[PDB]
Amino acid sequence: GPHMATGQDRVVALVDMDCFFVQVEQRQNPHLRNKPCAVVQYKSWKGGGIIAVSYEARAFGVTRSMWADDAKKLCPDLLLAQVRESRGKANLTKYREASVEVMEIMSRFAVIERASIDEAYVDLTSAVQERLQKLQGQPISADLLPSTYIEGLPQGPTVQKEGMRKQGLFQWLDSLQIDNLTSPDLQLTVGAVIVEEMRAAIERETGFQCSAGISHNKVLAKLACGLNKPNRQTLVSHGSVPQLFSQMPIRKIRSLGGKLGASVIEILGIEYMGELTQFTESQLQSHFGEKNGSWLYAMCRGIEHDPVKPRQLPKTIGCSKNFPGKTALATREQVQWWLLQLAQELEERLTKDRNDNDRVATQLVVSIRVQGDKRLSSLRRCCALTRYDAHKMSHDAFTVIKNCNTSGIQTEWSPPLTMLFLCATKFSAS
DNA sequence: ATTATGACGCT
DNA sequence: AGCGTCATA
Ligand SMILES: [Mn+2]
Ligand SMILES: [Mn+2]
Ligand SMILES: [Mn+2]
Numbered sequence: 001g002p003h004m005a006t007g008q009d010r011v012v013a014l015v016d017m018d019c020f021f022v023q024v025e026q027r028q029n030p031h032l033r034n035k036p037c038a039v040v041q042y043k044s045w046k047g048g049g050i051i052a053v054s055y056e057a058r059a060f061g062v063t064r065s066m067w068a069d070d071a072k073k074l075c076p077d078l079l080l081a082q083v084r085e086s087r088g089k090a091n092l093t094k095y096r097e098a099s100v101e102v103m104e105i106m107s108r109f110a111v112i113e114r115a116s117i118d119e120a121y122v123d124l125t126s127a128v129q130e131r132l133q134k135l136q137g138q139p140i141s142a143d144l145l146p147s148t149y150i151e152g153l154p155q156g157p158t159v160q161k162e163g164m165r166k167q168g169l170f171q172w173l174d175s176l177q178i179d180n181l182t183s184p185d186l187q188l189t190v191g192a193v194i195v196e197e198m199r200a201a202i203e204r205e206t207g208f209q210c211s212a213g214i215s216h217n218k219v220l221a222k223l224a225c226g227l228n229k230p231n232r233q234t235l236v237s238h239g240s241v242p243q244l245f246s247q248m249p250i251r252k253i254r255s256l257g258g259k260l261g262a263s264v265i266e267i268l269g270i271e272y273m274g275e276l277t278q279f280t281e282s283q284l285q286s287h288f289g290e291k292n293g294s295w296l297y298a299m300c301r302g303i304e305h306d307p308v309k310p311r312q313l314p315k316t317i318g319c320s321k322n323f324p325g326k327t328a329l330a331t332r333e334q335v336q337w338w339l340l341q342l343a344q345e346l347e348e349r350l351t352k353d354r355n356d357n358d359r360v361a362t363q364l365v366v367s368i369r370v371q372g373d374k375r376l377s378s379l380r381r382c383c384a385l386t387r388y389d390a391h392k393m394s395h396d397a398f399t400v401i402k403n404c405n406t407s408g409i410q411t412e413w414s415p416p417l418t419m420l421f422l423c424a425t426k427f428s429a430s
Numbered sequence: 431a432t433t434a435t436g437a438c439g440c441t
Numbered sequence: 442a443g444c445g446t447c448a449t450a
Contacts (some may be wrong), residue, residue, distance in 0.1 A: 022450095041433060042433080044433095050432080051433075064449095066432085083433095083450095089434090115448090116436080116449045117449070117450060218444065254447085254448080255446090256447095259446070261449090314437090315437080316436060317438095318435060318436070319434090320434050322433060322434085375444090377445090382443085
């Protein structure tokens with residue numbers, strides 16, 4: 001009754017850029033705008049690997065992870081932009097810099113948690129209390145929410161899509177009680193008004209469009225964001241959760257897309273998020289561990305407490321390259337040449353980071369993969385990072401991996417290396 | 431031969 | 442510490 005936590009204490013948003021690397025390339029090259037377009041890395045192997053796809057191109061069935069040669073079969077007029085290559089490798093700097101543009105705009109509104117290169121969470125609880133106080137029990141007009149969907153509406157007693165959005169919004173606003181500054185539905189709505197403003201600013205100041213979700217926690221905000229992409233935002237209320245979850249595949253919720261989610265489905269013999277409500281907290285804990293079980297017990301009821309971390313900057317800076325198939329590194333000087341290439345990119349990015357962000361990395365992580373290993377990393381070793389020097393860093397990396405070579409003679413490397421990875425970590429203020 | 435990342439959890 | 446899981450362009 002009066003003591004049941006409902007997890008409606010916060011207003012959290014997730015803002016996620018639409019087809020982000022594609023938009024970055026479309027801004028730069030107007031010829032790619034409003035076309036089936038994709039971003040590709042490399043070219044030689046089957047036309048290159050697609051890592052971002054415009055919504056026009058998705059209509060033809062083009063997806064991420066597709067080889068460009070295969071995508072061309074679905075969509076002959078597909079336009080392509082290539083990821084930059086520097087020092088023999090893909091270099092993602094243009095996209096990291098475009099990300100910073102967006103993160104700095106979002107930070108004007110609230111402390112953000114950078115969750116990826118193209119998305120951040122915002123805790124808008126405080127900002128909502130402020131906007132409510134100036135509102136002065138003013139109703140919220142539909143015109144203040146021009147791109148917002150209310151999940152689950154319209155419902156009950158027009159065949160166009162924008163018509164449907166407006167009808168749902170009208171029902172939502174009609175039902176609102178703007179008289180109560182502590183009403184969670186009202187707070188979400190004011191949250192959505194602020195996110196319209198945030199999104200307008202992003203687009204005005206960068207040219208990039210984005211989508212967003214507004215809810216009471218990060219997981220619901222993330223899920224909400226995806227419901228009406230592209231270029232729209234979606235409000236998922238506490239009350240909308242039972243219907244939403246009653247047909248929502250478990251794998252759709254963040255963190256459940258892998259082995260754990262598969263095990264929830266297998267062990268409990270269920271399919272949808274809402275079916276989880278029929279288990280006790282102890283029952284879920286028994287199968288999935290203390291932390292996961294409690295998290296599942298609350299999550300299936302729309303409740304989650306994971307805070308929005310105040311972290312706008314990535315806490316690691318890394319450089320990685322695969323050496324597939326026959327390109328696997330089989331000689332010493334090969335290994336040393338590529339460690340230098342990686343190390344030089346790292347030094348470049350590290351030095352820029354120190355200047356911009358007043359910090360220094362203190363640990364260097366070196367990872368490799370060896371042929372045969374299904375695993376993604378075969379081996380990970382750390383050493384001190386005391387100087388931003390590429391030659392020192394590459395020499396040190398070699399030192400930590402020197403012994404992995406199984407060949408008797410030292411000139412050859414075996415078994416051949418199919419991946420090198422250098423990561424700077426453990427930052428301290430400077 | 432999707433690749434290049436980046437965060438968090440376990441022991 | 443090193444490994445594993447999950448995620449995101
Ligand atoms: Mn995106
Ligand atoms: Mn994203
Ligand atoms: Mn995506």
